[model samples]
Target: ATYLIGDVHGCYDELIALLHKVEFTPGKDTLWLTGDLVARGPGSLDVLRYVKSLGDSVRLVLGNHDLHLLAVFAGISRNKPKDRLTPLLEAPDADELLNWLRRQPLLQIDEEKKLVMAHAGITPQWDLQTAKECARDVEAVLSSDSYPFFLDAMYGDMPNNWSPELRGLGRLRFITNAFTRMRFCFPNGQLDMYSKESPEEAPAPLKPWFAIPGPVAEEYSIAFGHWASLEGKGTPEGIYALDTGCCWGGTLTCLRWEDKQYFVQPSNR
Candidate 1:
């Protein structure tokens, strides 16, 4: 069996409890983590270690917080006092842990299951193959020794619209935003990068990425973990918003792939 879990946000104990609740049998069942595995909670170090130890049983995409961790580690971004990532930064194994993290993909797809997983939803501008190619383009940069260059170049929302003409850091930045930071956007795929409003509260012409009726939604079911403000509400069919704000006193959610069943373990914070 395969289980897809929501954002952990450094809530290590809650993750362990949720794993126990699901009867996670390391060698038997597979686990797909929806990212944001660190930040905003205590135990970020333990979370990194435990999840790293899961090894082959786990697959994950990078979330905004996860990217923030990478940027801070690379000295491109400052570490905030509230981020709770200091322990992770100061750990003896920090380099090893962060190197492993920087190598994770921004998107993962199981074609046999017709399922796409990303920390944030995919943009309407690209179909699955295009998305895969785009993800690989950025993944190659992040996996290479010049990763710090990409991290430094990836901090903007300009060129918000996707175009085949986009190239270099501009192209990679747009792809990174869509995969890790996107939420609301116009149907035409112009991203509203500054807003964190819920769908109902968002101003005109802005809608959640998955609601735009794109080829990705038509062809695949998306399991994504950003936008916890949605409160698990108003997602279109075939689009699953699994981030239930575990670090904000909401539950850690899990969806069983084979059965489409949900198992939730509430935050113990």
Candidate 2:
């Protein structure tokens, strides 16, 4: 069995309860996730420890919050009070956890399931091959010796438009934002970095990333998590928006990849 879970956001006990409810056996059942594993919840440290312990049973892309956590660790960004990250920051295993996280991919594909995923949806203009290379480009920096340099410089919103001709940080920033922070896009494929409202309330000229027609979705089902406000609504056919606001007094929800069944656990807090 394989489970594609949405943002966990440090709700460790809630995650445990949901897994227990389904009798999930780690070695037998793989867990694929939508990142943001730590932040905005009380058990961030435990969550990090638990997932690392799962070893080969898990696969997850890095969400925007995850990159922010890495930025704070790299001394590029400061941790905020409500982010609830101090416990993990000060843990003895902090380096190990960060290294593991930094090594995770921005995209994951399961050819048999015909599914592809990024923390946020992939840009509509990028087909699977281009998307794969773009993801690899950012991933190379994240895992390289120069990662801190990239992490420090990764906070900007410039060059929101993607171009094959883009080079250096401008190109890096565009790919990172597309995979981790994208919400809406202009008709020309330029990213809109500031919008967070649900679809019906979106201001003019901003369309949901998945709602925009693209060839990638024609051959693969896309799964993503960063937009919890949607509560699983507004995506076009074959795309799954899995974040159900688990850290916002909502629920931890997931979809069973094998059968498309949903499993939900309300917030324990």
Candidate 3:
């Protein structure tokens, strides 16, 4: 059996409970984490350690908060008190854990299942092939010593449109945004990086990334975790928004990908 869980955001106890609800066995059932494993809640350190210990049973992606953790560790950005990540930063094993985190991919896919997963949804401009290539391009940078440099430069919202002509930082930045921060988009496949509105009020010409009907969603089911404001509903068929805002006093959700069955555990916050 396999389970795909949404943003944990340091809700470690909730995650444990959710997994228990599904009778998850670490060595047998595979677990796909939607990222943001730490932040804004108690137990970020424990969450990191637990997931790291899961080993081969886990497939993880990097969320925006996860990237911010990398940037903070790199000293490229400041750690905010609101994130409640001090314990994680001060842990004796911080280096090993963070190094492991920085090496994670921004995307995960199963060709046989025809499913794609990212912290945020894939961009409308790219099909699965393009998304995979773009994810690989960034993953290579992340897995190398040059990662801190990439983290330092990846702090802005710019060059919001995608083009094959885009190269270097602009290209990487666009891919990062689409994979980690995107929600709404302009009609021309240009990302509206600033909007966090729910689907009903997304405004004219600005539709949620999934609303645009793209090649990726047309052919594959996509699982994403950002945009907790959607309350875990509203995505079209083949697109799953699993973030029920666990750290935000909302529920934690798990999707049994095989049967499309949902198991939810409410926050104990």
Candidate 4:
């Protein structure tokens, strides 16, 4: 059996409870984690160590917060005041942890199952190869020793439109945004990242990623976890929004492919 879980965000106890709720056997069932495993809560280090210990039974897709954590720890990004993430940034395994994180794919796909995994929701505008190429560009910089310098280019809100002509960090940023921070956008594919409100009031001009139709890439059922604002709502029935805001008093959810169903362990924290 296989299970795909959403952003953990340092909620270690919740993850454990969710695992138990599903009665998962580590050796037999493979687990796919949709990243953002650290930051914004306690136990970020614990979450990293625990998941890494899962060995071959686990697969991970990077998240924006996850990448931010890597950048901060590498000294390219700053620790936000009042942020609960410094411990992870200062951990002794920071370098090793960042290395492991960079090697992780930005997307996970099983052709036979027709399921795609990403940290942020993906619209139909991108096909699998385009998505993979975007991921590889970031991975190349991340896996290099100059990753810290590359991290400087990781931020910004420019070149919002996707085009093959985009170069340097602009190209990488567009990919990162689409694969990690995206939720809604203008009909023209321009991302609006400022809103955190629910879907009903997504600033009039924007629409959910999946709602944008056409032959872009909506062919597969994509599973992602960045926009907790939607309360997990998304277009395309099989397309999943897994971040039920576990650290924000919602359940940590896991979907099993066996029967095309879900298992959830409600959070009380």
Tell me the tens digit of each residue's lDDT in model 4 across 184-257. Answer: 87887677767767778877887887777634345677788878777776446667888888877887889888
Cα lDDT tens digits for candidate 2, 1-269: 98888999999998998898778898899998899999998998998888888888988899999999999998989889999999999999999999988999999999998999888888888999989999999999999978999998788999898889999989999999999999898887789999988988889899888877787988899999989888877677799999989999999987888889999999987
Q: What would the per-residue lDDT of candidate 3 be over residues 62-177, giving only the tens digit for each residue?
A: 99999999889888899899999999999999999999998888999988988889999898899888898999999998888888899887777999999989998999899999
Best by lDDT: 3
lDDT of each: 0.90, 0.90, 0.91, 0.80
The TM-score of predicted model 4 comes to 0.94
Q: Candidate 3: minimum summed lDDT over ten consecutive residues — where?
A: 194-203
Clashes of 2: 0
User: Rank by lDDT, descending?
Assistant: 3, 1, 2, 4
In angstroms, give how far residue 181 of model 1 lies from its true place: 0.5
Backbone clash count, each prediction separately: 0, 0, 0, 1
TM-score of each: 0.98, 0.98, 0.98, 0.94
Query: Model 3, 22: alpha-carbon shift in Å?
Result: 0.5
Comparison by TM-score, 3 against 4, better one = 3
Better of 2 and 3 by lDDT: 3
Any residue pairs clashing in model 2, and if so which? none
